[PDB]
């Protein structure tokens, strides 16, 4: 259960919470996360995004 963050607004993405109400349910691979996804605070082209996501191992 990793978590990412945007180096713009500073929004942490916890797969344990995610934005299931945005076409992205918890426990989702950042990879699967459709580029359509845009930080609700600093959208972002998913380019300024890093870290990990989705719970595993
Ligand atoms: Zn953000």
- CATH code of 23's domain: 2.20.28.10
State in Å: Cα 56 to ligand 1 middle: 24
Q: Is there a contact between 23 and 34 (Cβ–Cβ < 8 Å)? A: yes
Q: Which domain holds residue 44?
A: 1-57
3-state secondary structure of 12: strand
For CA atoms 17, 36, 30, 51, give the dihedral sign. Answer: negative
Which residues lie closer than 8 Å to 26 by C-beta, 6 or more apart?
Answer: 15, 16, 17, 18, 20
Spatial separation of the C-alpha atoms in residues 47 and 37, rounded to whole Å: 12
Domain count for the chain: 1
Which residues have beta carbons under 5 A from ligand 1 (an ion)?
6, 9, 11, 39, 41-42
- The distance in angstroms from the start CA to the end CA of the chain is 9
């Amino acid at each position: 259960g990793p978590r990412m963050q945007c180096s713009v607004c500073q929004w942490i993405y916890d797969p344990a919470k995610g934005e299931p109400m945005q076409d992205v349910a918890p426990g989702t691979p950042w990879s699967e996360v459709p580029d359509n996804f845009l930080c609700p605070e600093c959208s972002l082209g998913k380019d300024v995004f890093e870290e990990l996501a989705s719970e595993a191992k």
